């Protein structure tokens, strides 16, 4: 019971899962902890900052560049001055997007400090677009009301009273204006997929499915409707239920009617090309086409969240390009910081970009000179040698996926599936809530199975894995492109060992 | 008409203000741009990352520490593992808070990536506290309804029908549950001061007064009520109008009555000890005591935003400690990154801290090992030599404030006031909307006066100043504690020159 100032509950919980270790040094695909006698134990890292480390921990080329930037007296804090590196970074991302999609679309860049901040720039810009559509619609309704009033107060037309259930000339117009103003102040909706993960700030948390992470915060901010990814059939009806109307007066020269017209409620659709919070499921072509339909139908942007799938993880720079997802806005973060600094970017198609956003949105630390320099280095590295790095991710991914499939095939009793693409892979664990072993069953029931299995992998095979998915029902594999054949073989051995113990329901070996 | 990929509108606007320059290098209180012939021109920086650079640009001690951390193979990405530096940082902040306030309160630390993200951790934890208060209140109401039902369906008591205007035993209870459920799902309120700046993300932007930055985003997220700082008289009534009731049945053995009870609407009160968005006005004792009364009365936390006032800027570590503001939660960011990295912290009093927050809140980049190491270095630097660094800030502050007051006294026709404390100072500019010069008048009317005057100071005196406040009506002075007497004299000369031109209404010299 000594004084503790952070992390007591987090550390207590990690210790009971068998993950209570302090990593003291890291290089490439290895993190080191200290044993009882103070010796470094190498651990293979398959978590890698939840896919931040495409080039591994502390890549010598990123470390050298960071030290050169610091020694050159880089201007980190140059707010409200010319920072051409921001334009230079956006130009490269623009060229890469054009090459990978064959589309000649141009994107404005706004920078931020995290994946959530980049997603929230997109939520804000989407709401600027919706307020533009609202202004246009309300201006038209004013004109339609003036024309209907001209016709009713001067002979021409008679107000049909069959339509009054939707609400005397002047009083009907007051009732319409009251109805419309209420509608206009209502919060918008966001559309996301089931299992969506888009961050955990006040805005972004509402876009994140995981119920214990989100539901306490429901009242703070605009909600999302979580569309069922597996059944595109059902999305149509869910979105149709969210339809809302404003009222106007329609003149048919003879008769004036109160009529409903459509109100823009949906600010944006968000999609991850490979769904982190769903256990690394790739968006199917059928779901891609439903998101395209929704975007074309509602006139709101489709925001492609590549915070995790970007910077080569899937075997292309953009996962969306690989899977044929045609977004209006794109977000990047994780790997762009080179595994050492914090940086993110929102790319917004220039034909939709509202110039006000460049001067009403800002952040102290955004576009800092240090992370700008490191971004340019990361982009040079991932693009080097005519795109060989993408090729390496693809062949390392194939080797790791083949190993995971080979393991699943011999352990189908405890492993249901392999998901993901390139170096963003996961094993789906079969439910263990009815497990013979009480200790395993108890942990599975509390949603901790993945964490317990991760602990086994650490203490018995010196491999760092973290679970994914809503009840730690998936094991994530997202190492660097430098993962060796030998490290893949040691992972295979570790998994056969883990899944043999799980088949045998050896609770004393698995749960501490 | 060439392709541009970032910052076209930002750069166009900075050029027209006379602030179109690229800083290529920075050291201490100097940023350098390149002249036509490629020579470095020294500019004195009074903006310093909006008060991020208490130790100046690229302090050798922070640069050396950052390079040592990178060369040691510091684990930047160690998510869901033991990271003791987080507890070590919180321990130091805890010890400093105790020393400066004489209170023996303990604080839990949650880390993030920006000042806004730290403020949003506080908004989220404040909403967890409100959901706890709501659960308790609704549990009591259930018990009160059961006891009232027992008494009405068995002789004891008669339902008084004088109270029914607030809504048959079973039907009155259904109407109460419907009323209460509607109330429970309503968005909360935040309380802030007029001129408040708390960040610009989906949640935090609602807490920021500046109307063009906020009003486009009104529909997204819980609003703030902006309390008038200068007239505490009026705060009582504004908060009293926001009172909301839930219903219950109160048994007085004899009679059962429908009665209103208080519902917790206000999630949190936010305050800056020195109000950045108000032109650096310090919170008065009278306003401090009104915020204390509101906090004690509503039972919500008082969140002290020290993103700008913290890490020694005001002549103490905590500005709140200096001005007697007794917060429940505190936020820090800017200077804690050493002017090179991105880091922030929310300190939440342990007697209020809800353990769920440690495991339902997270961020990829939060608590990274590199910014953790740099935080410890910054804390060691600001605390060194038994607090002499705070003494230095106070005597540099006095010297700079005295100079600004000396300038005001001879230029009261264009300068209305000096605001702030320690090294967080501003000049208030008198309104120039009636200026003789058309060019000046036009710029003042558009809210750009401060920016224009900043441009004069850059091109004619090689001094970087940025405006503050809602219509660039204040000039910010927030240099490093290394600001020399000579740099203060050059600033005095530059300001006499600027304010002499403004008195003379020399529009051709001031506006390009
Ligand atoms: C697809 C996607 N979108 C947004 C985010 C939020 O990025 P951050 O705010 O930098 O953590 C992320 C971060 N993802 C990690 C974050 C885990 C955590 O919150 O610590 C994960 O899924 O495990 C993301 O993956
Ligand atoms: C008192 C206070 N609270 C929160 C913030 C937001 O922190 P960040 O998200 O890191 O920009 C800040 C940032 N302040 C600067 C930054 C301006 C900007 O670039 O957005 C200012 O007042 O001008 C702050 O001062």
Residue numbers in the entry:
A (entry chain A), B (entry chain B): 6 to 172, 178 to 522
According to the publication:
Previously, the biosynthetic pathway of the immunosuppressive agent caerulomycin A (CRM A) from the marine actinomycete Actinoalloteichus cyanogriseus WH1-2216-6 has been identified, and the critical role of the (S)-selective ω-transaminase CrmG in the biosynthesis of CRM A has been reported. Moreover, the activity of CrmG is insensitive to inhibition from ketone α-ketoglutarate or pyruvate.
For these three crystal structures, each asymmetric unit contains two dimers. In the structures of CrmG with l-Glu or l-Ala, clear electron density was observed between the N atoms of those amino donors and the C4′ atom of PLP, indicating that we have captured the external aldimine for these amino acids. In the structure of CrmG with PLP-Glu, γ-carboxylate of the l-Glu portion not only forms a hydrogen bond with S372′ but also forms an additional salt bridge with K210. Based on these three crystal structures, amino donors l-Glu, l-Gln, and l-Ala exhibit strong, moderate, and weak binding to CrmG, respectively, due to side chain differences. Moreover, in the case of l-Glu, which forms stronger interactions with the active site of CrmG than l-Ala, the corresponding by-product α-ketoglutarate also exhibits very weak inhibitory potential with a Ki value of 145.9 mM.
